[PDB]
């Protein structure tokens, strides 16, 4: 009867920035004890419902999204915050009410040589509306010259890698970010706590 949080929060692999695996979870009892205690949670900031009173209100339908972010720009994950991660590959709607979680992680997110498997979007024809997947590698064209479909003098591949290293610094190191979104009154509450 317990929610499959262990099936989302804890895992060995994750999408980089754009293949974020949106998992919808319902028909459960919501527990906000392990999350509330924070423990190793780097930043438990939540936009919308207060974090203290989460286990009181019965939500309708809840989604979990996960990805990895560079960290110096973790703040970009919030309503009405432009940038490069919040504007091209993961857009949060204005009326967002859920919570955002960030875990500091170097032990499991950086090989000795340096990870190159955390691609994130770099260019796009138009800004991305909230909550829209973007999984496609079609070469961009900065200039007027059409480069066809290989590359060009003003054409780039729209997926660059973070370039992680074990040392890096206090910033510029992988932060695993997971955001929970709640629907307001779609139907009678389906998940609630004790």
């Amino acid at each position, epitope marked *: 009867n317990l929610c499959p949080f262990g099936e989302v929060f804890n895992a060995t692999r994750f999408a980089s920035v754009y293949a974020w695996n949106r998992k919808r979870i319902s028909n459960c009892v919501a527990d906000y004890s392990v999350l509330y205690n924070s423990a190793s949670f780097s930043t438990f900031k939540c936009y919308g419902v207060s974090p203290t009173k989460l286990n009181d209100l019965c939500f309708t339908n809840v989604y979990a999204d996960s990805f990895v972010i560079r960290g110096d720009e973790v703040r970009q994950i919030a309503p009405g915050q432009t940038g490069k991660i919040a504007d091209y590959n993961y857009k949060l709607p204005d009326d967002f009410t859920g919570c955002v979680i960030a875990w500091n992680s170097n032990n499991l997110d950086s090989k000795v040589g340096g990870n190159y498997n955390y691609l994130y979007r*770099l260019f796009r024809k138009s800004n991305l509306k909230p909550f829209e997947r973007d999984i496609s*590698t079609e070469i961009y064209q900065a200039g007027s010259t059409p480069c066809n479909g*290989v590359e060009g003098f003003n054409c780039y591949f729209p997926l*660059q*890698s973070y370039g992680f290293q074990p040392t890096n610094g206090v910033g510029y190191q992988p932060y695993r970010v997971v955001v929970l979104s709640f629907e307001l009154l779609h139907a009678p509450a389906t998940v609630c706590g004790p």
Partner: antibody
Amino acid sequence: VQLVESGGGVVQPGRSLRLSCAASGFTFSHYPMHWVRQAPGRGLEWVAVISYDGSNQHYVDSVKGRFTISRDNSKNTLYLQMNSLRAEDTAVYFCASLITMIRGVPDYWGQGTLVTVSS
Amino acid sequence: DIQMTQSPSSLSASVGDRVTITCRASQSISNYLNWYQQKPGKAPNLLIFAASSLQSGVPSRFSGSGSGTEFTLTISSLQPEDFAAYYCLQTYSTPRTFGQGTRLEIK
């Protein structure tokens, strides 16, 4: 993460030869792919490139028409068909992916495939 | 369409920290380049990323600057395990013609 190639040999001047390039590890359906030629005891030249969807086929202005290249994402392979070959084609072919301005696409090459058409 | 030339094409490098390779293009390339290495009978691997950027997996000795129409790779040591090809490659247009090649001696 690796990639290998097969289909080489020695044949008469002028015939249909199909060679395959199979790559595992890095996802194959996201990046273009290039074929590069190296003649023995000389530099190396470029022949052709294929995009991710296999809709565009750019070639060098030396084997235009003779060569053809396609991809099979489900099989996760690159197929190069060369026909009406001539003597100078004798060389070693490499199946590669080449970076242009960003560190996104990897740069693995395999080993190569020798093909001489003296017969 | 685009044709390249690297002047030396052959050099002798005894004990010394000053070995350089010059690469030149017919048309203004800006800062689009690649410099690759090829050991005798081995698959070539990267040596320089683009114009003046390195690629993780090689020491910091290798260097290269200059954009537009002239390019110069330079090294600052010997480490007698890098005597191999120093090929030059373009990333400007679809022709993408390579260079000629180079060889390193032992004196």
